[PDB]
Amino acid sequence: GNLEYKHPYLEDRDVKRVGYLVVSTDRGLAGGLNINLFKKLLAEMKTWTDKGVQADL
Amino acid sequence: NLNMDLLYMAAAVMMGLAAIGAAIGIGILGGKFLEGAARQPDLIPLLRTQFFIVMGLVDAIPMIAVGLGLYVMFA
């Protein structure tokens, strides 16, 4: 709406540190569900940290 | 002769009350109009036509008192 404000969570800024929440099982026998997710996370976490960004989990 | 001067005086007090009455009344009404515009700037032409429906009534009684103030000036 027209009554738009400024707020830290709405404002846009350049990444100097990055965070991920990550969900995993407590139980095995799920096949590769965890590992495939963790591989995809490891690629992006590598890509940002090569930009010098400390990752956080 | 005091008859002339005190007629001059009676217009001047009656005029000042009408000037205050109008100036304050539309100042208050105009303040809420500017709050509406700052809150809701899409509607300001709509609110403008509302503000002028109301503004004429605030003026109406003070303008009568100006009419008598100018007649007691004139006569």
Across the A/B interface, how many CB contacts are shorter than 8 Å?
4
Shortest CA gap B58–chain A (Å)? 31
What's the reported resolution, in angstroms, to a tenth? 3.6
In chain A, which among 1-57 make CB contacts under 8 A with chain B? 2-3
Phi-psi sector, A29: left (phi>0), alpha (psi -120 to 50), beta: left
Residues 6+ apart with CB under 8 A from B19: B62
Give catalytic status of residue B59 as yes or no.
yes
Contacts of A2 in chain B (CB under 8 A): 40-42
CATH number of the domain where residue B32 is located = 1.20.20.10
- Give the range of the structural domain holding residue B18, as residue numbers without chain letter: 1-75
From the candidates B25, B59, B65, B68, which is the catalytic residue? B59
B39-B43-B46-B50 Cα dihedral, nearest 10 degrees: -10
Q: Both ends of chain B: CA-CA distance in Å? A: 15
In the numeric block, which tokens belong to residue B27? 């100042």
Going A10 to A14 to A18 to A24, the CA torsion angle's sign is positive
Q: Do A3 and B39 touch (CB under 8 A)?
A: yes
CA-angle at B31, arms to B29 and B32, nearest 5°: 70
How many structural domains is chain B composed of? 1
Chain A contact set for B42 (CB, 8 A):
2
Technique employed here was cryo-EM
| CA–CA dist B47, B51 (Å, integer) | 6
